[PDB]
Subunit: 380 residues, 3 copies
């Protein structure tokens, strides 16, 4: 019933700009196209906001983001996100699922974090590196401040642009896309020793759930074998892998998110062939569409609510939501709204807050959707 | 009574940008300035929307567009459209005619489709070609997919940008401007044989009416003699000419419009001197002002209405409006609104529609304005 | 109580763009970021509008503007204005003063009028000139049409961009920032003889008041000695100086404002060290914060009101407000609103107007705020 995309082709900057603007103009009521800075070579770092209320963060509405093409020659991501912009804009109103999604979530899509790199890439490139780095030749996914290793590559404009952006909005869930393998990689990406060993995050459980939500839907990925004849040593049970255990990555964007914002991000490898021929494109969409969809929905699971100031009766800003035995607290936005991803199980959440008295409620998250929980705090 | 323009000078990109932004800022309630892509040399392809409801297509409100400077060295167009942006913004509210126009129509003006070309042009150039082509040196008016000849020049960014744009909005009437002659040229621009012979379009009659509406108002053009001492072989009865009969043009933007959208476009040659000296500029405006005005009004003539779904009671999207013996159907927008240009005479319109049962009403279009006609269709 | 800035560092274009966009996005309800053109090297000439009604000029709401970094290597301004954008956005709502300001005034901030120049500058530069001029090497502050000397340097894009901008909005008060000295310089900047002599403007009194409002608050400036060991010949009583008397400046932007718009502009020299090391930055903010604040408030002092057409009962556009014995009339905006800066004293204002009969009321401006005065004019 829902309308599938049709524009299945590699989109160079010029056309991606065109494509993007066409949708920004054709559905002005659902979209908001903006830039977040400029690549070294001055190419806009475009993002397509898709909400039934473009431009504004409404209270209790979770903010989600997808990022693709961080590595210039890893193209599948870029195209899939365009396919998505289309699919979403086209089915909004007509299709129940899409309409529901665009209404309940504020989706932000950036098809290419490294557009300069893309332009220097070669179609057909399977495992190469030409165009991977940015214009100054640094790995944008080694360019972020790492928690263990101390990054040395100078901060690149695409990096800075994006860091700022991650601070600008209350991003809850996110996924940045790649190519070179088929698996959804989760935190941590590295370890104190800098070796390929499992490096567990406080939120290990949730992450496994998140990664699986996507991999479960991409059939060949779920199988665990990315490409038996190329990289025959790779085997990922159910298509997900802790980053560090696969191989140590210091300076990545994935862990930065987690460690410096409330956002929880996963790295998705869409296939061993980095830059496949344009003909394969539609197949990549058919294989990831349900995945991309199912993944976004996860932004709703867990717990959410507001931290209301008992005397005003209104939201407190930057209150802290702490959970049972998970050492990764979460903060609240301007309307005191908060979102905390968790797995089915019973927890003990505590709303902390400067100048207020902490409250602790026992909450019960189950298999399905998210539970709403409000914390009213008195002063001192 | 109405206020005439004053900024009579050649505007290079920098200043055209400035000029444009000044009006976008001074009259934010009537204007919306946007880009549609970037020239090869990264210059924005600006468009100025002028509606009393900038940014939105309201149902039953016809969408109109003027495009100029496709050929870099053909400057008169560029300037006239700027003069127009001014004239419109300045008289809105004060002047009855302008106010009426901006309210009833959603006008889109693009002063330069080929800004790179412009910059390489020489003032005073009368028949030359320096700056005509785009930055990669292709004739943007030979760059479109032709119905007879099969175009070979690679698609240029300015072309692609514009094609996309023609798809983005429900353009009803349009006119792209030129220099090198004095006549309004209409479809078709070429023929199966690729020779200078009359090549009739299904809408030949309407086109002649449209072309005349403009030429009738430009005195010297209406006379039929563009410039007796330069190109003395040219004689256009009443200042209009079928394109192909004047000379075969394959790949033009004019015919593309017609054949791929609902938009009906005419090519207007504003004078034999492509790049006249800035001093002549005001005279060109005085001679075309009434023309530019009268032409836009044509967007209202003929027939228009909605294709309402009988069970919902609301507009059907992409229904087809077919006319008596004219083989060039028209589609409806998102609110099921449609606009069909026709000449005074009696027709038999049929609203076709997938999943619905066709209706056929006999309509009567007369000398003056347009007739409103709604088609309510039942399902199956 | 109010929140101070934290981002204390030199911001190159890339980061300034990022910084700016972050605030445009984080506080969309209070801000509106736009460009006014592009530097020679195509860098946007950004401006941050900060009003509780971004994008619209509401009637009777005074329009204010701050401009910095006209001279590439004079950096303090650029940074302070960024600090300000922050400070304002961050305290709006929380802080009473800021909230009041953003509500009553439409503030426009341009951190860098000469971004190309900036990029070619050297941190630590104290009195040098590298990066002062624009990309084509002209002094943007000698590039404006002068009232005495006749400017020869070709008009630069940054100049043109800004001139247009000064025409686009009803700017009432303004201040462009500099480095190389510590004093607030006021009109006129030059004289018929082109020498360093006092060149008095019709509004001399008001200007002295305006300049002092700022200098009084910057302690070391108020002292009158900019930097005793560098430029030991400089002594400015109370930190303000008539421009021309300090030294003849023909072609400046400061006097242009006055002479071609209603805007009254002052030139502020923030310190002898043009490009100090990033470490000093916070100190510069601590020393100018109250100044920048107090200065903006001056936009409210004097007299203001509307020129209502007696028969319509609505505002007349471009009426003239003439004062007692001050030869510098003022015009009204679209809602017939006007703002006239004056000093405590008694005046005799006359509302002139084409097609109407002049009225003259005796008004009394005092020490504190501004007085509202409306002029209803009959026709003829
Ligand atoms: C893409 O950019 C990345 C940087 O973000 C480049 O990776 C860097 O490559 C250099 C060159 O080998 C590495 O430095 C070398 O390290 C060895 C081992 O310690 C040392 O012996 C050498 O003297 C030199 O310092 C650097 O570690 C590495 N950085 C990262 C984060 O991997 C990469 O080369 C670029 N890719 C291409 C194709 O140019
Ligand atoms: C501006 O760009 C247009 C292309 O859009 C250029 O026109 C093209 O010019 C070439 C050169 O003559 C033509 O190709 C030649 O055709 C002849 C005749 O068949 C053939 O014998 C030659 O071997 C060659 O292929 C081409 O047909 C023509 N295309 C069009 C659409 O007219 C034009 O040259 C450019 N103008 C300038 C001043 O550079
Ligand atoms: C920055 O740009 C300004 C122009 O806006 C440059 O100032 C100009 O410098 C030239 C060179 O000396 C001056 O012209 C000379 O004037 C003398 C004296 O009359 C004459 O004898 C020479 O033949 C020559 O014409 C010009 O007056 C001056 N303009 C202004 C407004 O000061 C300046 O040089 C540039 N700065 C740097 C570091 O390049
Ligand atoms: C916990 O705190 C939340 C913060 O307000 C609160 O949200 C508020 O919920 C109420 C009731 O659902 C909404 O009521 C508004 O809309 C209804 C109509 O739908 C009107 O009848 C009301 O007068 C009112 O306008 C609020 O819109 C919503 N937010 C605010 C700011 O009021 C949660 O509902 C609270 N409860 C729980 C269990 O979490
Ligand atoms: C054919 O179908 C058109 C599609 O609706 C229809 O347009 C609608 O016309 C009605 C009546 O003119 C308008 O009525 C609205 O505004 C009036 C006040 O001006 C109110 O009293 C009504 O309650 C209503 O809100 C509609 O705005 C207009 N469009 C829609 C969506 O209703 C044509 O009028 C129809 N008739 C013909 C002869 O073509
Ligand atoms: C001189 O002329 C000014 C131009 O109108 C005038 O401004 C108008 O002032 C009135 C009264 O303060 C305002 O009244 C509006 O708002 C109140 C509620 O706050 C309503 O009760 C009224 O019905 C009305 O909607 C106007 O908003 C304001 N502007 C306009 C266009 O009406 C000055 O007040 C006049 N008087 C003086 C002494 O200058
Ligand atoms: C939000 O909350 C934090 C703490 O709840 C506020 O104070 C510090 O913020 C930093 C942010 O990096 C934390 O690392 C510290 O733990 C917090 N406490 C102290 C003593 O510094 C912070 O000011 C608030 N704002 C932001 C943006 O975090
Ligand atoms: C709108 O209508 C057309 C036909 O009414 C829909 O289907 C085809 O659209 C193409 C468009 O190029 C036409 O050439 C065909 O004649 C139509 N029929 C068939 C069997 O293909 C079309 O899907 C609708 N949407 C658009 C954008 O045209
Ligand atoms: C606004 O008012 C002026 C005069 O009140 C109008 O007419 C002339 O405007 C110029 C503007 O440069 C003044 O120098 C003249 O003194 C005015 N009078 C004459 C006889 O020219 C002007 O048209 C109006 N509009 C603007 C933009 O100024
Ligand atoms: Zn990768
Ligand atoms: Zn032409
Ligand atoms: Zn200076």
């Amino acid at each position: 019933q829902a309308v599938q995309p049709v524009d299945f082709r590699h989109h160079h900057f010029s056309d991606m700009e065109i494509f993007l603007r066409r949708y920004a103009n054709e559905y002005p009521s659902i979209t908001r196209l903006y830039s977040v800075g400029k690549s070294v070579e001055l190419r806009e770092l475009y993002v397509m906001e898709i909400s039934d209320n473009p431009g504004i963060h409404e209270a209790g509405e979770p903010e989600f983001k997808y990022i693709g093409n961080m590595h210039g020659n890893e193209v599948v991501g870029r195209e899939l996100l365009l396919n998505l912009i289309e699919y979403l804009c086209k089915n909004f109103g007509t299709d129940p699922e899409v309409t529901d999604l665009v209404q309940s979530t504020r989706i932000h899509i950036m098809p290419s974090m490294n557009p300069d790199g893309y332009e220097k890439s070669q179609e057909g490139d399977r495992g190469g590196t030409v165009g991977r780095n940015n214009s100054n030749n640094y790995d944008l996914n080694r360019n972020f401040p790492d928690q263990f290793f101390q990054v040395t590559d100078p901060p690149q404009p695409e990096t800075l642009a994006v860091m700022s952006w991650l601070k600008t909005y209350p991003f809850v869930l996110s996924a940045n896309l790649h190519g070179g393998s088929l698996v959804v990689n989760y935190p941590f990406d590295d370890d104190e020793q800098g070796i390929a060993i499992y490096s567990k995050s406080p939120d290990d459980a949730v992450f496994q759930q998140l990664a699986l939500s996507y991999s479960k839907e991409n059939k060949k990925m779920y199988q665990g074998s990315p490409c038996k004849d190329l990289y025959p040593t790779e085997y990922f049970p159910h298509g997900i892998t802790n980053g560090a255990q696969w191989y140590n990555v210091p300076g990545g964007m994935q862990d930065w998110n987690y460690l410096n914002t409330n956002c929880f991000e996963v790295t998705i490898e869409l296939g061993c062939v980095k830059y496949p021929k344009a003909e394969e494109l539609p197949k990549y969409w058919e294989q990831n569409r349900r995945s991309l969809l199912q993944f976004i929905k996860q932004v709703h699971r867990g717990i959410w609510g507001f931290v209301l100031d008992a005397t005003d009766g209104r939201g407190i800003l930057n209150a802290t939501i702490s959970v049972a035995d998970i050492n990764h607290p979460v903060t609240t936005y301007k309307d005191g709204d908060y979102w905390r991803l968790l797995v089915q199980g019973t927890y003990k959440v505590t709303a902390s807050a400067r100048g207020y008295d902490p409250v602790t409620k026992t909450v019960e998250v189950d298999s399905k959707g998210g539970v709403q929980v409000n914390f009213t705090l008195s002063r001192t």
